[PDB]
Design a protein around this nucleic acid. Structure first.
Length: 57
RNA sequence: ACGAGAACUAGUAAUAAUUGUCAUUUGCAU
């Protein structure tokens, strides 16, 4: 049960409704979506990291 | 399988214009 720390050094747009909107934190929805899209881009197998991983916001 | 994805705060125009470094004052009393 490890935790990850994120440093950016470049400004980030995270969005709620419109591109001119700004939000500070994002939810496990967008995070899990990103992990899924990068898993598919890598061409790895998705079953393992679909129904076993629990992510906090 | 991220309220996403496309998207040059870009294009036009300058320090310009009229102004003199002048106006008087013995290389002079042996």
């Amino acid at each position: 049960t490890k935790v990850f720390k994120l440093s950016f050094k470049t400004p980030v747009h995270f969005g709620k409704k419109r591109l001119s909107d700004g939000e500070m934190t994002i939810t496990a929805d967008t995070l899990f979506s990103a992990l899924f899209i990068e898993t598919l881009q890598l061409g790895k197998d998705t079953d393992w990291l679909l129904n076993d991983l629990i992510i906090s916001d």
